[PDB]
Amino acid sequence: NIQGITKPAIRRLARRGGVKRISGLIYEETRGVLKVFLENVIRDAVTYTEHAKRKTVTAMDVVYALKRQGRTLYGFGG
């Protein structure tokens, strides 16, 4: 579940971002932020994959769902 996003994994993203010191309460805040974004993308992906009477959500549905939210993504076709 949501406990698979471990503290070193969270801190590596912060290091790439460019921070130098991290307070101890950050991880709990960021997990609940990521969980909200994933739901928003997946709901549209599932609606797209359900309109076409399919049973497997494909990569193009994810690409379209990302595209209509103001976030396009190159490198997966289309």
Binding site: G18, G70, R71, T72, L73, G75, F76
Partner: protein, 105 residues
């Protein structure tokens, strides 16, 4: 029999663009010299980025462009960075930058 692209002195295909404009429900009719204008723009933009990426592909002592070299081409120039402002290139990475307050004295 020559091709329209060769007659117009281009590299991109004009007939395919003409067909794509028609079969796209954009307008009822399509003018004659619209594809020959639209295909000359798609090629200049491609030649710009493929020229800006070859310098990055050489500064790292490589001879084959990879997505990381395209990432550094559209982020180091205002004109292209403002056009691709909301695009996430896969396997791109970030641009090296450290705030000046963080460094030691």
């Amino acid at each position: 029999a020559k091709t329209r692209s060769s007659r117009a002195g281009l590299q991109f295909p004009v007939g395919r663009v003409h067909r794509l404009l028609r079969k796209g429900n954009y307008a009822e009719r399509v003018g004659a010299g619209a594809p020959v204008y639209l295909a000359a723009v798609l090629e200049y933009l491609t030649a710009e980025i493929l020229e800006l990426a070859g310098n990055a592909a050489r500064d790292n002592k490589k001879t084959r462009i990879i997505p990381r070299h395209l990432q550094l081409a559209v982020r180091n120039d205002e004109e292209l960075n403002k056009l691709l402002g909301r695009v996430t290139i896969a396997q791109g990475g970030v641009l090296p930058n450290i705030q000046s307050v963080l460094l030691p004295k």
